[PDB]
Structure 1
Amino acid sequence: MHLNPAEKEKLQIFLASELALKRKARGLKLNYPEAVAIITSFIMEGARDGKTVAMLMEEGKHVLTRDDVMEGVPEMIDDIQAEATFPDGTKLVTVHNPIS
């Protein structure tokens, strides 16, 4: 596979996101690390899909809403940042105030 250090670490994000999505599917309000994991994995999978940085800056604001998360979680998350390999190489995505 020839995994580099970043590829190994970022598998962890996907896994945390899968864990969080199972918790959301059985009716739990998500916590801080759960919410961050879901939005982060969403950005990385969007880059893999070939979306633009601009598309993911918009979409990342609509992945989870206030009523998906515990009290205070929206205000704890000022922004989520992820780097992924786009068709044109690694780019940084910052999603501002992802949960309104």
Structure 2
Amino acid sequence: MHLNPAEKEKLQIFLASELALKRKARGLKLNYPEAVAIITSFIMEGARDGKTVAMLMEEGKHVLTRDDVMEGVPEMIDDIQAEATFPDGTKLVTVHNPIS
């Protein structure tokens, strides 16, 4: 596979996202690391799909809403940042104030 350090680390984010999505599916309000994991994995999978940085900056603000997460979680997340391989190489996505 020839995994480099970042590929090995970022597998962990997908896993945490899968765990969080299962918790959301059985009706839990998600906590801080769950919410971050879901939005981060969304961004990285979006890059893999070949979306633009601009599309993901918009979409990332609509993955979770305040009624998906615990009290205070929206206000704990100022932004979510992720680097992924787009068709045009690695780029940084920042989603600002992802949850209101």
TM-score range with shorter-chain normalisation? Answer: over 0.9
Q: Could you list the per-position Cα deviations for residues 49-93 of structure 1 after superposition, in whole angstroms to 9, with x for gaps in the alignment?
A: 000000000000000000000000000000000000000000000
Name the SS for the 1:98 alignment partner: coil
Name the SS for the 2:81 alignment partner: strand
Name the SS for the 1:20 alignment partner: helix
For the residues of structure 2 that align with 1:6 and 1:47, how far apart are their CA atoms? 15
- Runs of 5+ in structure 1 lacking a partner? none
Name the SS for the 1:16 alignment partner: helix
- Runs of 5+ in structure 2 lacking a partner? none
CA-CA distance at 1:31 after TM superposition: 0.1
For the residues of structure 1 that align with 2:47 and 2:85, how far apart are their CA atoms? 6
For the residues of structure 2 that align with 1:71 and 1:79, how far apart are their CA atoms? 17
4+ residue runs of structure 1 moved beyond 3 angstroms? Answer: none
Q: Could you list the per-position Cα deviations for residues 14-73 of structure 1 after superposition, in whole angstroms to 9, with x for gaps in the alignment?
A: 000000000000000000000000000000000000000000000000000000000000
For the residues of structure 2 that align with 1:72 and 1:33, how far apart are their CA atoms? 13
For the residues of structure 2 that align with 1:33 and 1:76, how far apart are their CA atoms? 10
Identity across aligned pairs (percent)?
A: 100
Name the SS for the 1:29 alignment partner: coil
Give TM-score scaled by structure 2 length: 1.00
For the residues of structure 1 that align with 2:3 and 2:25, how far apart are their CA atoms? 31
| Paired residues for 1:85-96 under 5 Å | 85-96=85-96
Q: CA RMSD in A?
A: 0.1
